[PDB]
């Protein structure tokens, strides 16, 4: 009950900042997550015994893939923590509980392959879930772990509160399907500009939470350049493996996934920042002004990729 998690001074301070890197010490990541839950939600919103058992079962169900791994899970949860802490009064108690857990669970049992590859392979999951294939699987895996004995961290919620939080988690995880992001941001952009955006409108909150999930999911583009540059390697290690597997199915992959077209990565990143990341954090900053540091860091990284192209690194 009176058991706080405390971090070393440097982590205690830097964890509050959007550009925090959770570090290479895997065994500190569970504690970093509990620290964030306690400060974001309260020392009381989860039974520590059940939370710790939930965290370790979630960890076990992430795979040893270069990017879509346990470190990504905790990194995405931290970005959500920074958004929630900088927008204290805008989110309900249930939302704060739901979203940190949604972020931790959002890529559960990822194999390092896109929805497109599953469909072209004809993976069983592509028959079970025709769209947002991996994302429906991630939510399914979340519910499965919540239903392990001693793993239901929501046990002390009322029946209606329980249905609400599982609904928040389901929408949040589905929203991490980047195919759904483009239309979601366009709608949010229209609503902000015409002035129809209303956070008391549940369908509008859903859209804003969706964008927050995209923003947290892409947050490797909001780190200091050395973190962004080195994480880029990990995402491209997966892309190139998927490209190899496309060639094994007799299909030329998109250049992004072709390890023979490694030369084209810098220009591929410009496209990604301009088409996905910058628009995402711009719309997020308009809706939630205190998330501006994510947009600023993203612009800095765009400028670093421009310097790579100009041979200045
Ligand atoms: C349209 C297009 C072209 C090329 C690439 C791309 N996808 C991504 N590229 C890079 C990152 C990334 C990760 C970590 C650090 N820095 C960058 C990333 C992260 C998440 C999802 N997608 C991507 N999309
Ligand atoms: Mg995902
Ligand atoms: Zn993710």
Please give the DSSP secondary-structure letter assigned to residue 132: S
CA distance 99 to 311: 41
- Cβ atoms 104, 74 nearer than 8 A: yes
The total number of structural domains in the chain stands at 1
Residue 226 belongs to a domain:
yes
Q: Exactly one of 19, 68, 78, 137 is catalytic; which is it?
A: 68
The number of the ligand nearest the C-alpha atom of 68 reads 3
The residue behind tokens 């790579």 is: 308
Q: Dihedrals φ, ψ of 151, to 5°?
A: -110, -5
Stated resolution in angstroms: 2.0
| Residues in CB range of 128: below 8 A, 6 or more apart | 136, 137
Q: Which domain holds residue 306?
A: 28-310
Residue 256 belongs to a domain:
yes
Residue minimizing CA distance to atom 20 of ligand 1 = 218
Residue 184 belongs to a domain:
yes
Residue 159 belongs to a domain:
yes
The number of the ligand nearest the C-alpha atom of 103 reads 3
CA distance 45 to 186: 35
CATH code of the domain covering residue 226: 1.10.1300.10
- Cβ atoms 100, 40 nearer than 8 A: yes
Q: What's the burial of 281, exposed, middle or buried (CB within 10 Å: 0-12/13-18/19+)?
A: buried
- Cβ atoms 148, 243 nearer than 8 A: no
Pocket test for ligand 1, best of 235, 263, 308 (most atoms within 8 A of CB): 235
Residue 166 belongs to a domain:
yes
- Cβ atoms 172, 99 nearer than 8 A: yes
Residue 271 CA, ligand 1 centroid: distance in Å: 10
What is the experimental method?
X-ray
């Amino acid at each position: 009950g009176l058991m706080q998690f405390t971090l070393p001074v440097r982590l205690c301070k830097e964890i509050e900042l959007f550009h925090f890197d959770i570090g290479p010490f895997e065994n500190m990541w569970p504690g970093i997550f509990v620290y964030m839950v306690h400060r974001s939600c309260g020392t009381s919103c989860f039974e520590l015994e059940k939370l710790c058992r939930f965290i370790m079962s979630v960890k076990k169900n992430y795979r040893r893939v270069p990017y879509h791994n346990w470190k990504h899970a905790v990194t995405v949860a931290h970005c959500m923590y920074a958004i929630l802490q900088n927008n204290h009064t805008l989110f309900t108690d249930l939302e704060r509980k739901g979203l940190l857990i949604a972020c931790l669970c959002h890529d559960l049992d990822h194999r390092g392959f896109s929805n497109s590859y599953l469909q072209k392979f004809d993976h069983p999951l592509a028959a079970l879930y025709s769209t947002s294939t991996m994302e429906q699987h991630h939510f399914s895996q979340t519910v499965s772990i919540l239903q392990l004995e001693g793993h239901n961290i929501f046990s002390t919620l009322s029946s209606s509160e329980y249905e609400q939080v599982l609904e928040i988690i389901r929408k949040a995880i589905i929203a991490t399907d980047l195919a759904l992001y483009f239309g979601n941001r366009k709608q949010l952009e229209e609503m902000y500009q015409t002035g129809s955006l209303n956070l008391n409108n549940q369908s509008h909150r859903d859209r804003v939470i969706g964008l927050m999930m995209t923003a947290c999911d892409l947050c490797s583009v909001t780190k200091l350049w050395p973190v962004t540059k080195l994480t880029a390697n990990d995402i491209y290690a997966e892309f190139w493996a998927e490209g190899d597997e496309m060639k094994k199915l007799g299909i030329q992959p998109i250049p992004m996934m072709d390890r023979d077209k490694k030369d084209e990565v810098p220009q591929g990143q410009l496209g990604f920042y301009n088409a996905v990341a910058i628009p995402c954090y711009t719309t997020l900053t308009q809706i939630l002004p205190p998330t501006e540091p994510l947009l600023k860091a993203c612009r800095d990284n765009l400028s670093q990729w421009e310097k790579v192209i100009r041979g200045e690194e």
